[PDB]
Amino acid sequence: KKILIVDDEKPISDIIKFNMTKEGYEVVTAFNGREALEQFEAEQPDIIILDLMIDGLEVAKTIRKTSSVPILMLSAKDSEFDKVIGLELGADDYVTKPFSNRELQARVKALLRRSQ
Amino acid sequence: KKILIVDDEKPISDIIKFNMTKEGYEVVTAFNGREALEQFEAEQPDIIILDLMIDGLEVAKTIRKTSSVPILMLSAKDSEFDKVIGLELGADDYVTKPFSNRELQARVKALLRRSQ
Fold first, then answer.
1. Chain B residue numbers touching A58 (CB-CB < 8 A)
2. B1-116: CATH number
């Protein structure tokens, strides 16, 4: 399976990339909203992890216009408002930073199970 | 033309209702998100003024699933983040409270011109 990691911070992109690779996923990366949409269209990932630091919300909105691909939002923002609007804009899950590497793996697995 | 005013505060509903009536519009009112959607479906308004105090954002989201009806969001929240996400979720305009009665009229007119 193929995971698109959309993160504008290289250190954390690198950790998630390393951990998903170790799990056997093919990883593609994007570091802004434009690259996120370009990579989504060209690579047709099975799941998207979305951690941009309002741009993330538009990315997810735009993807949902044409695709049901699972989106796992990842964010340092952990308020009720933040989680609710991420989910309403089309996120399938929302996970806060800092996160457990094992939990992130488990949640990616759960999402992929649920979308085939 | 018919205007649905979605506002959970009766005093301000009443002012907008009075002012739109004086202008010759037929006015229907809703005081929560559920009533907003019920009134939208049953009355098929030409424009919606939306001022609920996250529920307002879901109302607008839900309407856009089936309708292009103009939505003018009205809110005491006046931050860049607030205006941008109102517009992104499908609002055609976003106006802050307190507002000018004449400006509100002008903006309703501008929206109706633009949607027929």
1. 88
2. 3.40.50.2300
Q: Which of A12, A11, A2 is nearest to A96 (CA)?
A: A12
Interface contact A10, partner B, CB < 8 A = no
B46 annotated as a binding-site residue: no
Give resolution in angstroms. Answer: 1.9
For residue A87, give how far its alpha carbon lies from the nearest alpha carbon of chain B (Å).
Answer: 11
Cβ atoms of A9 and A30 closer than 8 Å: no
Q: Pick from B58, B84, B88: which is nearest to A88 by CB?
A: B58
A61 part of contact set with chain B, CB < 8 Å: yes
3-state secondary structure chain B: CEEEEEECCHHHHHHHHHHHHHCCCEEEEECCHHHHHHHHHHHCCCEEEEECCCHHHHHHHHHHCCCCCCEEEEECCCCHHHHHHHHHCCCCEEEECCCCHHHHHHHHHHHHHHCC
